[PDB]
Write a protein that holds these residues in place. Structure first.
Motif, PDB file in Angstrom:
ATOM      1  N   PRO A 214      50.356 -50.310  29.627  1.00 55.69           N
ATOM      2  CA  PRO A 214      49.184 -50.174  28.756  1.00 55.69           C
ATOM      3  C   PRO A 214      49.528 -49.474  27.455  1.00 55.69           C
ATOM      4  O   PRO A 214      50.669 -49.045  27.264  1.00 55.69           O
ATOM      5  CB  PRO A 214      48.206 -49.342  29.598  1.00 55.69           C
ATOM      6  N   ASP A 215      48.559 -49.348  26.553  1.00 51.82           N
ATOM      7  CA  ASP A 215      48.797 -48.682  25.281  1.00 51.82           C
ATOM      8  C   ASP A 215      48.254 -47.265  25.223  1.00 51.82           C
ATOM      9  O   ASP A 215      48.831 -46.433  24.518  1.00 51.82           O
ATOM     10  CB  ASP A 215      48.192 -49.489  24.130  1.00 51.82           C
ATOM     11  N   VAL A 216      47.172 -46.960  25.933  1.00 51.85           N
ATOM     12  CA  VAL A 216      46.641 -45.603  25.944  1.00 51.85           C
ATOM     13  C   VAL A 216      45.732 -45.440  27.155  1.00 51.85           C
ATOM     14  O   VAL A 216      45.025 -46.372  27.556  1.00 51.85           O
ATOM     15  CB  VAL A 216      45.908 -45.271  24.622  1.00 51.85           C
ATOM     16  N   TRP A 217      45.788 -44.251  27.748  1.00 52.73           N
ATOM     17  CA  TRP A 217      44.906 -43.819  28.824  1.00 52.73           C
ATOM     18  C   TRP A 217      44.005 -42.717  28.294  1.00 52.73           C
ATOM     19  O   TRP A 217      44.499 -41.721  27.761  1.00 52.73           O
ATOM     20  CB  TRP A 217      45.704 -43.274  30.008  1.00 52.73           C
ATOM     21  N   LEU A 218      42.696 -42.872  28.450  1.00 56.15           N
ATOM     22  CA  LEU A 218      41.757 -41.826  28.074  1.00 56.15           C
ATOM     23  C   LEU A 218      40.963 -41.401  29.295  1.00 56.15           C
ATOM     24  O   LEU A 218      40.643 -42.226  30.150  1.00 56.15           O
ATOM     25  CB  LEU A 218      40.809 -42.291  26.971  1.00 56.15           C
ATOM     26  N   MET A 219      40.665 -40.112  29.386  1.00 59.59           N
ATOM     27  CA  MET A 219      39.876 -39.559  30.475  1.00 59.59           C
ATOM     28  C   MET A 219      38.565 -39.031  29.914  1.00 59.59           C
ATOM     29  O   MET A 219      38.564 -38.269  28.944  1.00 59.59           O
ATOM     30  CB  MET A 219      40.636 -38.445  31.190  1.00 59.59           C
ATOM     31  N   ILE A 220      37.454 -39.443  30.515  1.00 60.46           N
ATOM     32  CA  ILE A 220      36.122 -39.057  30.070  1.00 60.46           C
ATOM     33  C   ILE A 220      35.321 -38.658  31.297  1.00 60.46           C
ATOM     34  O   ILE A 220      35.045 -39.498  32.159  1.00 60.46           O
ATOM     35  CB  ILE A 220      35.424 -40.194  29.311  1.00 60.46           C
ATOM     36  N   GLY A 221      34.955 -37.397  31.381  1.00 62.01           N
ATOM     37  CA  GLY A 221      34.262 -36.889  32.546  1.00 62.01           C
ATOM     38  C   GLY A 221      33.490 -35.644  32.218  1.00 62.01           C
ATOM     39  O   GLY A 221      33.053 -35.448  31.082  1.00 62.01           O
ATOM     40  N   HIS A 222      33.311 -34.794  33.224  1.00 67.61           N
ATOM     41  CA  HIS A 222      32.610 -33.532  33.061  1.00 67.61           C
ATOM     42  C   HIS A 222      33.346 -32.445  33.826  1.00 67.61           C
ATOM     43  O   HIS A 222      34.070 -32.721  34.783  1.00 67.61           O
ATOM     44  CB  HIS A 222      31.157 -33.624  33.532  1.00 67.61           C
ATOM     45  N   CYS A 223      33.150 -31.204  33.392  1.00 68.07           N
ATOM     46  CA  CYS A 223      33.865 -30.061  33.939  1.00 68.07           C
ATOM     47  C   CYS A 223      32.875 -28.920  34.137  1.00 68.07           C
ATOM     48  O   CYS A 223      31.662 -29.092  34.000  1.00 68.07           O
ATOM     49  CB  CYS A 223      35.020 -29.666  33.014  1.00 68.07           C
ATOM     50  N   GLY A 224      33.396 -27.750  34.469  1.00 69.87           N
ATOM     51  CA  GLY A 224      32.588 -26.547  34.594  1.00 69.87           C
ATOM     52  C   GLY A 224      33.178 -25.422  33.766  1.00 69.87           C
ATOM     53  O   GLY A 224      34.299 -24.986  34.017  1.00 69.87           O
ATOM     54  N   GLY A 225      32.410 -24.953  32.789  1.00 67.78           N
ATOM     55  CA  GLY A 225      32.899 -23.961  31.854  1.00 67.78           C
ATOM     56  C   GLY A 225      33.211 -22.625  32.503  1.00 67.78           C
ATOM     57  O   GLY A 225      32.623 -22.247  33.507  1.00 67.78           O
ATOM     58  N   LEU A 226      34.158 -21.906  31.904  1.00 60.41           N
ATOM     59  CA  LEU A 226      34.582 -20.607  32.399  1.00 60.41           C
ATOM     60  C   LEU A 226      34.389 -19.485  31.390  1.00 60.41           C
ATOM     61  O   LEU A 226      34.761 -18.344  31.680  1.00 60.41           O
ATOM     62  CB  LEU A 226      36.054 -20.654  32.828  1.00 60.41           C
ATOM     63  N   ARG A 227      33.820 -19.768  30.223  1.00 59.15           N
ATOM     64  CA  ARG A 227      33.604 -18.770  29.188  1.00 59.15           C
ATOM     65  C   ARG A 227      32.112 -18.568  28.969  1.00 59.15           C
ATOM     66  O   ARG A 227      31.330 -19.519  29.042  1.00 59.15           O
ATOM     67  CB  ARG A 227      34.269 -19.186  27.878  1.00 59.15           C
ATOM     68  N   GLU A 228      31.722 -17.323  28.690  1.00 57.87           N
ATOM     69  CA  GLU A 228      30.306 -16.999  28.572  1.00 57.87           C
ATOM     70  C   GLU A 228      29.674 -17.620  27.334  1.00 57.87           C
ATOM     71  O   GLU A 228      28.464 -17.867  27.318  1.00 57.87           O
ATOM     72  CB  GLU A 228      30.117 -15.485  28.557  1.00 57.87           C
TER      73      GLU A 228
END
Lengths: 433, 433, 433
Positions: A261-275
């Motif tokens: 392939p030419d490029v892999w992109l990741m698109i999702g959600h996370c959980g923040g660790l900074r106030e």
């Protein structure tokens, strides 16, 4: 030799060998006959072999010349106008396993016929999958092993895959992508001409019903469905719904690397660790802390995984353009990846490491995709969106009541697609790229 | 105190506290008012606490007295007729987080209201989840944390779960189980009276339509759907479709342990490693070689995981009875568990260990379920069926053309159900079992 | 309190305590008298203490208020116009060791006097160097321990150090820097007004002899000489000649961190590992593979060390501008750092790792400087120049006949200085930066 002759010869040899093996299987089943051990030793069931000499000679066995046509042609012509090389095409001594050539029969066979097939015919040997230098990353017995599972995990033929891949883990992205694609196809002036869905659905601009692209039966049968948005040239977009976990993001990368392939992109959600972070803010990774125990036997954690400047610049530009404003809604930092979905119950340990690396977010897939894109030499990126604040008592769940993260789901995807567009607009190592 | 008084008092206290917190949230939202810090310090938002003294005193905080009624009642009466103990019920100093009590409001709130809720109201603290001795395995802040995710992963209320759990990974088993249950309910003389499906479907013997139990929308929204077959007493069967992977079989066990089940059974398919095995033969594990990197931080691989004689005897008897014949179709041995779905590409390493342990089959979930059933003191079993022969060139895939393993799918489930029936027919440690 | 009052009070208290201790030592030596244990317990030999309250209170002990004047003043005024804080100055319970206050006596004492000094006077305790939260990174007993060794390793007073630090390992750079500075001072329109050399030489624009700046006696006595180019404001350039080895680049960073510099730059030479590289080409690091065994006990190799975008952009711009042309003479890659000066004799091992990380050059100091700049929160950079090709049979030595690397020594330094200029032109965490 001119590359056209090489391509034609490879196609002819492969077709002849496959047809011969199919007919041998057929007449053994229908008449209880065996093939000669002398004529078969004349290279009757063997892969074609290609060699280029230019310092030394490089030889590999080709597995599907009609699918890799453009890639092989451009790589062969790039070594015929800039270097001095001789091209040779011949027969190899490796045989085509029969399970890979079943496309014209129906094996409703009892135990005796299966035993006979296993005994008198070539089969798969695990010591094989894993003039003196390799010409490509993979040989035929591995590419053919992977193409058989791409069609099973995904649900679409391997001839449809596109060079720009997007990974998600949340089905609302799939709904948005399908709707946007079906809207784009109807536009008279647009590169896209067709949409291919998981399960065998082909939607064009002349179909009576556009309301069957997204059916619920896809998630029943296939673990990782994929939707392709075809273009006339061969430059489209592919969306794959890998799921959740760091072990499902490794096998699909293993099987998908063989298409280059030419490029892999990741698109999702996370959980923040900074106030300072609020639900709905974007995180961009520039370093990964790997706590997933997979890939620790082939790529130890000592090896550093850098970032790619072009992809990060494209993502920043896309966010700036689409968001319509970014120093406060967008952060850059280190993301943690873990294989434990309940890390909270053991937080008091992990906290120490979470302090040494100055982490900004936590997720479950990005580091494995980055490692796999590092091993197989594919550009990679990542752009995450905060969905909860575990350490500050705002913990939520994906799919539950969340009115601030559900709003920015039709705009996150637009940022990803704009990044793909910007990347496309511009532009002991095996000689093939 | 007689246990009935304890149960009534616990229920009353819990109901009062939950109602108070709900009304405080409601009037803060609708009138911008805060609660007093003195009356709230009168144990206004606190869990009830139960203590038994008999050597020493044991105290724990109860979280849902109306769901654990039978278990608590029998455990309290078993310590009132065989020992000398005093029972006390009072108020604790731990507070009920608000996200657990939302059942009468709709939080369509902007950022200001969410910030106010986080600031002026109790929230979840990760240092908490993980007269001087514990009375049960878990406290209230962990049971309530797990009951909120059981309803999300699965799709059914936590009040329906049954004590005998079956795990699968292949949806054909789900189809067979649903059909068999719907056939059994209509029988006038049968213990089962209702079927509860994932997504909120309740099927009885007086429903016009029995043709909506198995819909395709369940696999869209819920990762691990479950089907319950209710009984009047409370002794039914639960089927859970965990999926594929050793990380999805650990979180569901973590969340399911707090209901105190009676037995966990695993029913799936594996890949044989011995030349004498044919597709369609049964494997019974008596030792596990753990190659999954999860659980290596809390239960090191040095610790041995034994087998349970009663469960193995029941499985052997069930196989003998249902199969209608077994020294050749049934084997007993050591099963390997790995987190790498593509172990073949690295076989040349693993081979060494595969020789030291005299393994008979390979799968992906059984060892993790056995370890989790060892940690939480739940009986466990395993009965696998061979689906391919990777090392002898008969490798296949789950869901592809396989006419010998698809035949024995309506009989494997019968063996599992008969084992459950036979088990039910007969029959620093916290005092609660 | 207004910060001016705090600064004046701190200075007065510190001066009083130091004078008292000096006079006590003097009259004990010259009259054999001891100090009272009651008046001394009135805070007679104690460090001043500063506290700010704003959430909570932060207290630390100040060690040299007249040297850190600007830093302390700006940090205190930045927390007096943007937050709400109260400032308090008092006496602490920690005592000033006597070896730090010797500036007016000559201890030509025999063993008896040394024993008496050790017994009746405060001394250094190793359990000490290493209202409830810290206000700065370091306390007084560590800053004072480090300032005593900065003056010994380097050879210049600690009051002269400048915020922009350059590290070298090749004395020709030192000669070029001294010549360029002496040429720049004579310019009537230039920020620089003085040059301070190792050994105690102060050169201005009104000195008869400018031909004593670079003497050979400096390398006799001091391990790591430094040259400062003073500016009227306090924004100059410092050059430090650390030497060779990964253990000399760690101690100097430890001792230099307490002055809070603005940027660390590394300028040296390496050995190329790619066949396309020619002697005289520039390498820019974007990831470090750490093979030096120092710092593996406090910062394990799992932790990733990222790069800083601003510094890399400045270095690229400086190279483009000064070189006067760069896609072929400048590369970006991963640099290896090793503590073994004879790695060739063991190459057959290291080769494996050199293939996994796709390395471009090898050196001996850069990774340790990057790690130290990561630990103490200081921006860092690196720009190396190829001096030999060990793997392709062109191996050379630093200082031997090399006519292509000796040409680009007066231009490498110019690139470093231009990078410093460009950086200066633009622009559980303790509240002090």
């Amino acid at each position: 030799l001119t590359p056209e002759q090489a391509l034609a010869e490879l196609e002819a040899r492969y077709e002849a060998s496959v047809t011969a093996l199919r007919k041998a299987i057929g007449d053994y089943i229908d008449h209880n006959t065996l093939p000669d051990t002398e004529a078969r030793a004349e290279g009757l069931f063997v892969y074609p072999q290609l060699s280029v000499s230019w310092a030394g000679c490089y030889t590999t066995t080709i597995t599907n010349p009609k699918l890799f046509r453009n890639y092989l042609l451009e790589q062969l012509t790039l070594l015929y106008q800039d270097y001095g090389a001789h091209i040779s095409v011949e027969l190899s001594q490796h045989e085509i396993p029969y399970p890979y050539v079943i496309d014209g029969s129906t094996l409703t066979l009892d135990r005796s016929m299966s035993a006979g097939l296993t005994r008198y015919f070539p089969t798969t040997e695990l010591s094989q999958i894993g003039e003196f230098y390799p010409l490509s990353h993979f040989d035929a017995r591995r590419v053919d092993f992977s193409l058989a599972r791409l069609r099973h995990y995904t649900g679409t033929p391997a001839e449809h895959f596109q060079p720009y891949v997007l990974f998600t883990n949340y089905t609302r992205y799939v709904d948005e992508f399908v709707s946007w694609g079906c809207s784009q196809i109807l536009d008279p002036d647009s590169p896209y001409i067709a949409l291919s869905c998981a399960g065998g659905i082909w939607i064009t601009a002349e179909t009576e019903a556009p309301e069957q692209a997204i059916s619920d039966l896809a998630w029943k049968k296939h673990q990782m469905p994929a939707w392709h948005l075809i273009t006339h040239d061969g430059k489209g977009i592919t969306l794959i719904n890998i799921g959740v976990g760091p072990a499902n993001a490794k096998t699909i990368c293993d099987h998908l690397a063989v298409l280059r392939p030419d490029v892999w992109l990741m698109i999702g959600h996370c959980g923040g660790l900074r106030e300072s972070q609020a639900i709905g803010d974007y995180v961009l990774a520039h370093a990964y802390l790997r706590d997933d125990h997979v890939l620790d036997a082939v790529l130890p954690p000592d090896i550093p995984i850098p970032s790619i400047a072009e992809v990060q610049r494209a993502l920043y530009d896309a966010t700036k353009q689409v968001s319509g404003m970014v120093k406060q809604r967008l952060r850059t930092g280190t993301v943690v990846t873990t294989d434990d979905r309940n890390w909270e119950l053991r937080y008091s340990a992990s906290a120490l490491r979470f302090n040494l690396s100055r982490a900004v977010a936590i997720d479950m897939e990005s580091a494995t995709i980055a490692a796999q894109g590092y091993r197989f030499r594919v550009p990679y990126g990542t752009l995450l969106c905060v969905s909860d604040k575990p350490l500050h008592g705002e913990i939520k769940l994906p799919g539950q009541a969340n009115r601030f993260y559900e709003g920015a789901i039709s705009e996150h995807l637009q940022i990803g697609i704009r990044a793909i567009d910007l990347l496309r607009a511009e532009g002991n190592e095996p000689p093939f790229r």
